[PDB]
């Protein structure tokens, strides 16, 4: 139904810029299609909408800084914030809805900061029944990062843990229990992928 | 600027009890939605018009009020009912929303299994040298790590990261991180890693030794 998509990392006082691709309804059919974000802290805001007519509605707060266009041939809205700040810093979501129904997107993270890009260096930690595997991800930035075992056919027994932020970088890790019996005899890596720096890197679990 | 206040902040309940989450407006609001949303996912609208519920939400759900006081309502809870919710309203400018009651389920307690690793080769192949300790599967999810050197509480320059309750097993896992240079942990020998949780008497006790 909708997704959402566009830069990471966008400067301070600089503007923010997001599409949302509809598919599977006309956008000017039907529907009130909103902009919604959600900021560190799970604080949510409703950012404003646009009718089945390009007739717009925004919240008050950002009423000057706020504009939403859309490109009806290409069934997709834009939003475009300007001036921004680190306060803006946030989970960007497209939605739709009338009376009674609502679809939501995934949902996209944008950073604003001065701060750069860096990938990020990813550590194995292999023991000191089951087993428990890890894989430390550190000194990157901006967020978000993604990682999955063996490609994914090890997403049970999976904790990856939210990030942490020190020093003007994130720092996450992420563990997999398997049984005894299948590590090291079956390989075990953890794939990790870092868009903002378009990173991806495979490091195998070795004893 | 009119603001929404749920309580509490965090709620927790058996699977099959009643729970009801309130929402206290500033000013009187005509309307109120709620929405619902999970760890990792989207929020969805979970009621509309203080009370109507959309397809999909089941009917144990039901919400009420009027005025400055609305609240969320489950007539009886399933594991499959814990995130958090949000109650909205439309009659002012801005659509402000609540803080969010996080609705934790409970269960019996279970102790964490600990497992602690030594820096990588790659690492101190960079002069880095962190210790990571895991504490997964445990209830309730208030615990303590304790980082010992030598035996002595290696106390600052840690960094601990909690996930959301499993989904899965209603558990909580967490994640002990202390940062320090190859040439500094080079230059001792006990590593430990301490877990205090309501499980055991005495803690859960896991180390290597630098050899």
């Known amino acids: 139904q909708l997704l959402e998509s566009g830069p990471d990392l966008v400067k301070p006082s600089q503007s923010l810029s997001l599409t949302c691709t509809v598919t599977?309804?006309?956008?000017?059919?039907?529907?009130?299609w909103h902009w919604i974000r959600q900021f560190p802290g799970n604080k949510l805001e409703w950012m404003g909408y646009?009718?089945?007519?390009?007739?717009?509605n925004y919240n008050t707060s950002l009423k000057s800084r706020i504009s939403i266009t859309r490109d009806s041939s290409k069934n997709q809205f834009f939003l475009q914030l300007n001036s921004v700040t680190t306060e803006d810093t946030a989970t960007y979501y497209c939605?739709?809805?009338?009376?009674?129904?609502?679809?939501w997107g995934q949902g996209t993270i944008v950073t604003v900061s001065s701060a750069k890009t860096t990938p990020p260096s990813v550590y194995p930690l292999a023991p000191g029944s089951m087993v428990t595997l890890g894989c430390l991800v550190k000194g990157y930035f901006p967020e978000p990062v993604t990682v999955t075992w063996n490609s994914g056919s090890l997403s049970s027994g999976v904790h990856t843990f939210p990030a942490v932020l020190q020093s003007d970088l994130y720092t996450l890790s992420s563990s997999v229990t398997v049984p005894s019996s299948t590590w090291p005899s079956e390989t075990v890596t953890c794939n990790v992928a870092h868009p903002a720096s378009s990173t991806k890197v495979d490091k195998k679990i070795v004893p | 600027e009119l603001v929404m206040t749920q309580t509490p902040a965090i709620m927790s309940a058996s699977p099959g009890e009643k729970v009801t989450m309130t929402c206290s407006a500033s000013?009187?609001?005509?309307?109120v939605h709620w929405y619902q949303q999970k760890s990792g996912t989207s929020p969805k609208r979970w009621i509309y018009?203080?009370?109507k519920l959309p397809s999909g939400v089941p009917g144990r759900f039901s919400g009420s009020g009027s005025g400055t006081s609305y609240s969320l309502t489950i007539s009886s809870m399933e594991a499959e009912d814990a995130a958090t919710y949000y109650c909205?309203?439309?009659?002012?400018?801005?659509?402000?929303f609540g803080a969010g009651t996080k609705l934790e389920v409970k269960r019996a307690d279970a102790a964490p299994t600990v497992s602690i690793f030594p820096p990588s080769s790659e690492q101190l192949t960079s002069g880095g040298a962190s210790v990571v300790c895991f504490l997964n599967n445990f209830y309730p999810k208030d615990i303590n790590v304790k980082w010992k050197i030598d035996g002595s509480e290696r106390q600052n320059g840690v960094l601990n990261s909690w996930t959301d309750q499993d989904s899965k097993d209603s558990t909580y896992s967490m994640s002990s991180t202390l940062t320090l240079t190859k040439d500094e942990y080079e230059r001792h020998n006990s590593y430990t890693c301490e877990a205090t949780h309501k499980t055991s008497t005495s803690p859960i006790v896991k180390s290597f030794n630098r050899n």
């Open positions: 939605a739709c809805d009338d009376f009674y129904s609502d679809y």
């Open positions: 000013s009187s609001v005509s309307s």
């Open positions: 909205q309203q439309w009659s002012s400018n801005p659509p402000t």
């Open positions: 646009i009718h089945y007519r390009g007739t717009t």
């Open positions: 018009d203080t009370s």
């Open positions: 599977g309804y006309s956008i000017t059919s039907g529907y009130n």
